[PDB]
Amino acid sequence: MLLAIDVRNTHTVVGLLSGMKEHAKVVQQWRIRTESEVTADELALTIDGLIGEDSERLTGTAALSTVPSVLHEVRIMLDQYWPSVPHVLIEPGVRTGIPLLVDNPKEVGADRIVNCLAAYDRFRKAAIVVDFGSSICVDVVSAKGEFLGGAIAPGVQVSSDAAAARSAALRRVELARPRSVVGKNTVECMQAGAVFGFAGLVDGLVGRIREDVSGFSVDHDVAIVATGHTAPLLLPELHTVDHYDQHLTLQGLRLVFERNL
Amino acid sequence: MLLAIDVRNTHTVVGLLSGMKEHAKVVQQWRIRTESEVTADELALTIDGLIGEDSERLTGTAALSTVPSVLHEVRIMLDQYWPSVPHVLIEPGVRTGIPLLVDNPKEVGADRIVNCLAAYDRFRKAAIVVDFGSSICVDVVSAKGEFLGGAIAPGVQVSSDAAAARSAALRRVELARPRSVVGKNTVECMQAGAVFGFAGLVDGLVGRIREDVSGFSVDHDVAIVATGHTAPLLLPELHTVDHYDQHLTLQGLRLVFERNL
Amino acid sequence: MLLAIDVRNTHTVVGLLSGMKEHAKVVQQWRIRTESEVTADELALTIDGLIGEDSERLTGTAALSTVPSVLHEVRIMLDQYWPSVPHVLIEPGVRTGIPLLVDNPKEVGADRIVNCLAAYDRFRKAAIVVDFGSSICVDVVSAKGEFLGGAIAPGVQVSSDAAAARSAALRRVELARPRSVVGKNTVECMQAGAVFGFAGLVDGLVGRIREDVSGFSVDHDVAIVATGHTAPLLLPELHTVDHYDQHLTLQGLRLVFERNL
Amino acid sequence: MLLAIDVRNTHTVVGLLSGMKEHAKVVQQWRIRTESEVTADELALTIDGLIGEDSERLTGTAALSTVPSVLHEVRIMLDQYWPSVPHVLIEPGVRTGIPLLVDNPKEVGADRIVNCLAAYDRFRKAAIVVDFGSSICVDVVSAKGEFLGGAIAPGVQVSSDAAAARSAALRRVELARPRSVVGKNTVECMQAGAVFGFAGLVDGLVGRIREDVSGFSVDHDVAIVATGHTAPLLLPELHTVDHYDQHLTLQGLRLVFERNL
Amino acid sequence: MLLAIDVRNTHTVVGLLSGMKEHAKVVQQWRIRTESEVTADELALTIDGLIGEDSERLTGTAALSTVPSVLHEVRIMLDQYWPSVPHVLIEPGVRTGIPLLVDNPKEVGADRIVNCLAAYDRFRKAAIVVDFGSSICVDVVSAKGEFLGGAIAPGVQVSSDAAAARSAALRRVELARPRSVVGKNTVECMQAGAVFGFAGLVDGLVGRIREDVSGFSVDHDVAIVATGHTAPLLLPELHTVDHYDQHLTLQGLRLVFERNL
Amino acid sequence: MLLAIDVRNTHTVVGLLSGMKEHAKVVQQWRIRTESEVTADELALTIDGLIGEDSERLTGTAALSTVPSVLHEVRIMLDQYWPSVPHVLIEPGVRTGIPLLVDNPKEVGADRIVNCLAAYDRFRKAAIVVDFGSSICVDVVSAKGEFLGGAIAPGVQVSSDAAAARSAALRRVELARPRSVVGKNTVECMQAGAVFGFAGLVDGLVGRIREDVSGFSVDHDVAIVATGHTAPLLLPELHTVDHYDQHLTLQGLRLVFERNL
């Protein structure tokens, strides 16, 4: 199998992907915390405990990170614990076959590049990727598979927790859909805010991108794809998102791994 | 005049309002930070420094606080520094004439009550109040002047600061409208997110309220009013908000003061 | 066995209970840190490591959480990792057989409900429960098995840590009984405060409850029970507490599981 | 006038005292919050704003601090802004005429020594001093005016704030007296816990001191004096405390100033 | 006079300078805390209280800031409260007559540019500027007055506070010279580290710059100048620093003000 | 196999040592984070996972901890989980055959004593030990194997992270050697500071110690040993440090274990 690692600011996705090229599928996926101060030995311990008996069956290990210290610890862990398998660590501004038509090609985070590559591979047309992570990352891929940029909004959970911490009457609540958009208690009001407001945020960003750029209007065909952990919660309230792909970034990591191999 | 105090989670607004009833208006306003550990003497010192020689011309004072410790200190300060003028303090579940048709009438913040009272006094019909503070508070006022609840979304500035602080690759940026919806650098992407996405958040909340609850549809005349310090940044991008009042909470405090006088 | 999970604000108790009804006892117990950001996969990994070979010998699971995010993750973990066994999850306002004679039955924490249920099951009369956790929760159970309310005092370790952090002269000390109430250095004075003053706090709360409400006086038969990890520290210095039950919340979780089975 | 400065870990008391020796009394007092990294210019600005036109009428300044940085900034401010007045700074271990019969006489903070000196000057016998500040300091003074020692418990407001911050279900509450010891909501439960529990804490500490040290029995006449900002709130719920003196530390500062003059 | 403002990360220097060109010296200076979220009204209040009756006698204001939000609020405060005075606010990358020979001329903070300008104005030759601020900034100015770059080390007091916060055994100690380099207790060891190790840090940076870049060898005449609030503390322990100019940044601000007028 | 545990304030080192007396060398080593609130069960879980199949081959466990809570949890963990092996815990001020000639011999941390013992055992003469950890510790050992004292400077990585977090314009950067001492951007300047300045800090402390104390001059022979995780980074840039030993504290724990048996 192929061991894929997605390090974000708050949560790390560890995946096992069997197969190769078109027939390859994600057979396993786990979500863990991201610790900035994590070491190679701790990360090896948790990853070994997650993947169990598949450690001896690894054929390669792809990895990206938005925290560079975790990326360097990933390199140390890979060389110390899995020396016989190849590994292609990904930095910001990686080369993949997707032209980075932006001001600073070396500053865009690796997750956005991987999402763009996977979306253009799956759809082969113009695409808008909405990634619900620690931040909501919106990526615009043209019909030629070129990364035009996009937007970076605060994430649902991070913003909700920040609002709960920044206020006294607002406490920490569970991220769930309330009975109505008009709440009757503080928990219901906060859940209505966090869910419906961020659904409106994503819909507004997608509609504004569709209207205010050429080739992405309603007349054209553009694949709107959402990924992330909290995407299924907000998906029924989105009128602008067509598809949900839970394994988009892992498939993109597999694409970069097979391209660099 | 009347000394109105608005203690929010992040900033405190001090206003001098002259006149009575309909002929009353905000003649002076200052904004300062809210200190959780501020005392009666410190707050009286800064308020005196702000308002100058108008202390002898005060006819009354009125305060609300979403922070309980500052509410205790404001109670002490009102009882200590201006004993000759009447004062009204506003605790959650206060006497206003607006029925609190919620599960816990004693848990709803005083700012929401005061905003609902001011909006219904100004419009005399069904209203949707959008306050842009530390959190974005959406309050729904029925056609008979009843507080039906609403939503509490994360605020623009708090969420953007939390996004910047959680990520090592994201620095502190100023909230300003970017060039296009598809940014080209990290700062442009973050600004596009924070501005357009939160405008979409407010639009989605107001549209969902208009569609779902009865008496607030397109056919019914509903007054959509926005207030707050960071409201003018998002107001040009809002499609659902009809009015902007920057002195709504001060006018509501004046209404409570004159009602309880 | 039954797997019981007590998620508190600071620590999490994981227990294995064998038997049913009266013949049921706690056969295993572990204490771990409560991580507010922990995930279902990480919690499943640590619980599997704790319980070892007992994973395949589970007949049911019961869980409570005072932290909403850990409650969400425990919900996911229960529906993901042990699908072949029943699971009861306890939210506030849970049907247990104990009436909640309070203003907001949906806001009393799950730990207090579970403690009241276990106490009234054990003693079958009026009871006062003192849980020593992050806070000291005092719960008042009437003679008919009704939760009348109680008090939430600051805890001992949390308050001592806050006092140490707020002052430059006070460092992180280890909680222990001093030689005397009148200490001679900073460590002795701080430990005398933390131990004897909080013992007096518990004694004063229990005595004032015994004096100020009907049915709990010295004439009535009232069971005073203490639970918690730091309870044995203050137990020799308490005059009002008659019983110490360490596994009270686990037994209450078992009671809820059997009631809802 | 004499300018007394009390720098505690959380608040600073600034007092103006008129008269000398027995005919002296506190005529002005203000409470401000303590900033650990405050500068001499900021502190001079706020102190000047507090004391008004009495800057030219000062005849000396007495200052103590539990935060040494603020003490050194106080010395800089005094030498820069009031050069014509004599100023006595007070460190731990200050010579006062009260012997320090403890293990480390140079570690007991200045506030405790000043309180002991003022109490023994007022009562001229054995005394127990309960000082409600950032922490609750209990001081025991024999019939010969010696500092035998005491206890240092967490303060009421600091502990309540820490309990609110540590727990997700608990918010910040206004420190006031509830209706009863058995609370019906979370706010009432927290207020009952903090108030009645800390009253029991003080009662337990004072009673244990009276019972466990020589000559402080109920038969012997021992004066119990309470000082502090939150002392009047807990005073009706105390049984072992007789006298309340708000200006005890300012009078002790006056005594030290007159001693070093 | 000229009102100069230095907004650093931790402290803000407010200076009044009289005269022009060679006849110009700093006549007033104050240091205050930098509140990153301060408003224009609070800043106007404190600056007015600092400058007293010199508000009407201002002829122009010069300001820089390493915190952009404070600079924006400074612009608002200046245009609201001092509308009749000219103001040249300074952003990073200011053109001053010192060529910026670095990779990103728009990213170097305005403080370093101002220090380089004032040092080259004073010495008219090659210079090394050591600024002890929140960080330690070493700037290298060539013989032709060109900013060649430098180094940014952690500050002295900031790193000492970080060490105290990261360790329980290390409390908040005061920054002062110890008896010797070999400390006989924890406080003396910490002060020996903070003083002598940071003096060695400055000496090592200065020596390595003198040895490893062209035109700055010991044979050439290079002026080594130090500035900052904690510079006098480490000044006697440095073997590589010849001059200490306390008002270097204020003089550079005056230079930029007179150049842009 | 001896099991060594080094609990520093930021990272914990775990070691497996085989052999006795001179024939003893470290065979295994891991580095993990240090958690303050960690429990015995969690720590036993991670230690067992780290050490794998060698848990049944242990013959003793020497452990030190600069965090006493983790030390007591280690004692609980060792007694609960490895009851058949001896365990020599180490507190501050331990006796090792090295006299502690300081003002408070019981306040110096255990890591310093262990490093001094190991260094004198290796070199059998006067030595200067530089331990790069959460704080840089410098230890001075005379020719008689006595702990004279030393310095505690802020660490490299800890101070770099503190500078990145405190300053708004500075992000979290990776700790690595830059190309030139005169950095041409912000990141290069920060890395030049963090590397060359801290190398100069160590060099200055060692040189000042060598000059100002008896028997440590250039004519005398004094072994200079370095240890720590980040030590090899600064080792090329050091001039006064002669030897490196990454396993100094583990061998010192081995020496204390062999001494206490």
Side-chain angles (χ1 to χ4, degrees), chain A residues 107-127:
Chain A
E107 288 283 350
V108 63
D111 54 313
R112 304 179 66 177
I113 309 165
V114 174
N115 284 337
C116 290
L117 180 56
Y120 188 66
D121 182 70
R122 176 154 178 252
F123 298 115
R124 301 297 182 183
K125 53 189 175 184

Side-chain angles (χ1 to χ4, degrees), chain C residues 64-78:
Chain C
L64 66 91
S65 181
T66 55
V67 176
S69 49
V70 191
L71 189 62
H72 173 255
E73 298 300 328
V74 162
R75 186 183 296 276
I76 302 178
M77 179 191 64
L78 286 185

Side-chain angles (χ1 to χ4, degrees), chain C:
Chain C
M1 296 68 64
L2 171 79
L3 177 71
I5 305 171
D6 290 344
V7 174
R8 249 63 171 264
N9 315 95
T10 306
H11 289 86
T12 290
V13 173
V14 177
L16 289 182
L17 294 79
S18 81
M20 292 177 72
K21 272 73 180 298
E22 192 269 340
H23 312 270
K25 70 125 181 176
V26 177
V27 315
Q28 291 272 23
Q29 193 204 304
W30 305 268
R31 206 170 81 115
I32 61 179
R33 296 198 334 274
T34 290
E35 280 291 332
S36 303
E37 309 301 321
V38 78
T39 57
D41 299 289
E42 282 180 324
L43 197 51
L45 201 51
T46 174
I47 286 179
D48 174 68
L50 288 177
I51 73 181
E53 70 287 342
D54 299 316
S55 307
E56 297 90 354
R57 305 200 289 264
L58 293 184
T59 67
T61 52
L64 66 91
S65 181
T66 55
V67 176
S69 49
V70 191
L71 189 62
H72 173 255
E73 298 300 328
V74 162
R75 186 183 296 276
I76 302 178
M77 179 191 64
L78 286 185
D79 289 345
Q80 180 182 345
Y81 283 89
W82 305 282
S84 62
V85 300
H87 47 77
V88 289
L89 190 79
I90 293 188
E91 304 89 3
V94 49
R95 181 177 181 170
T96 59
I98 299 290
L100 275 65
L101 265 58
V102 288
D103 294 353
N104 300 279
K106 269 69 63 177
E107 291 292 332
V108 63
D111 56 319
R112 306 183 68 180
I113 300 165
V114 174
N115 285 346
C116 294
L117 179 60
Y120 190 80
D121 174 73
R122 174 142 175 254
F123 299 110
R124 309 292 178 174
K125 58 184 178 179
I128 297 177
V129 188
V130 187
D131 197 311
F132 295 87
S134 317
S135 293
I136 298 174
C137 296
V138 179
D139 304 321
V140 186
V141 191
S142 67
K144 294 187 177 182
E146 308 167 333
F147 167 69
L148 266 46
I152 308 171
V156 196
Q157 182 66 72
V158 171
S159 310
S160 187
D161 290 4
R166 218 68 51 178
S167 179
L170 319 180
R171 69 180 185 186
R172 278 299 306 276
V173 310
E174 184 156 334
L175 222 50
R177 187 193 189 272
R179 314 180 300 102
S180 180
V181 60
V182 184
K184 303 303 178 183
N185 56 105
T186 298
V187 174
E188 284 196 25
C189 291
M190 283 177 57
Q191 279 173 349
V195 172
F196 297 138
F198 274 93
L201 173 140
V202 177
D203 288 332
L205 278 175
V206 173
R208 199 176 189 96
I209 292 169
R210 277 188 159 274
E211 292 172 0
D212 293 7
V213 65
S214 299
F216 286 84
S217 52
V218 176
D219 310 327
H220 296 87
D221 43 332
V222 185
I224 321 292
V225 58
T227 178
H229 186 81
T230 189
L233 172 65
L234 268 62
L235 177 63
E237 295 85 357
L238 288 171
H239 304 143
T240 66
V241 171
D242 299 328
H243 304 93
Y244 172 64
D245 192 357
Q246 46 174 330
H247 314 301
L248 194 71
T249 300
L250 300 178
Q251 294 291 345
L253 271 184
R254 178 200 56 83
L255 286 165
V256 178
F257 177 81
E258 290 173 351
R259 185 177 179 83
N260 291 264
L261 201 53

Side-chain angles (χ1 to χ4, degrees), chain E residues 67-252:
Chain E
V67 176
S69 67
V70 187
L71 193 58
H72 158 257
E73 295 285 347
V74 152
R75 185 182 295 276
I76 302 185
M77 171 202 73
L78 284 174
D79 289 345
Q80 181 179 347
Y81 295 93
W82 294 281
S84 64
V85 310
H87 54 69
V88 295
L89 273 71
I90 300 179
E91 292 85 12
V94 55
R95 181 177 181 170
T96 59
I98 299 293
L100 275 65
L101 269 68
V102 285
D103 299 2
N104 301 48
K106 264 73 66 179
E107 284 282 356
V108 62
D111 47 318
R112 307 180 67 183
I113 307 167
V114 173
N115 283 328
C116 291
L117 179 57
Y120 188 66
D121 175 71
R122 178 159 186 253
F123 302 123
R124 308 294 184 189
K125 62 175 182 177
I128 292 179
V129 184
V130 185
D131 174 63
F132 300 90
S134 308
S135 292
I136 296 178
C137 293
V138 184
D139 308 315
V140 182
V141 188
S142 62
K144 288 180 295 183
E146 304 170 353
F147 168 65
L148 261 55
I152 302 180
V156 193
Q157 175 65 25
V158 185
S159 303
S160 183
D161 275 3
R166 204 76 68 176
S167 182
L170 310 184
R171 58 194 185 188
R172 282 287 298 271
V173 312
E174 194 163 324
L175 207 58
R177 193 191 192 271
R179 309 187 298 100
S180 179
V181 63
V182 181
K184 295 302 180 177
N185 58 105
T186 294
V187 176
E188 287 188 17
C189 287
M190 287 175 62
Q191 282 177 351
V195 170
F196 299 118
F198 273 90
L201 169 142
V202 174
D203 279 348
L205 287 172
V206 167
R208 205 171 196 99
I209 292 171
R210 270 186 166 271
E211 295 164 10
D212 299 11
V213 66
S214 303
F216 287 80
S217 59
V218 176
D219 304 329
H220 300 71
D221 49 330
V222 186
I224 322 294
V225 65
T227 180
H229 182 76
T230 189
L233 162 73
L234 290 89
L235 177 63
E237 295 85 357
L238 292 162
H239 320 99
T240 61
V241 170
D242 311 317
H243 300 140
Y244 163 68
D245 191 3
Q246 46 176 338
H247 311 297
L248 197 63
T249 300
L250 299 180
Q251 295 294 341

Side-chain angles (χ1 to χ4, degrees), chain B residues 44-61:
Chain B
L45 202 60
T46 176
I47 283 171
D48 181 71
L50 287 176
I51 75 175
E53 64 277 4
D54 298 316
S55 303
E56 291 79 24
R57 287 199 274 269
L58 293 192
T59 57
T61 61

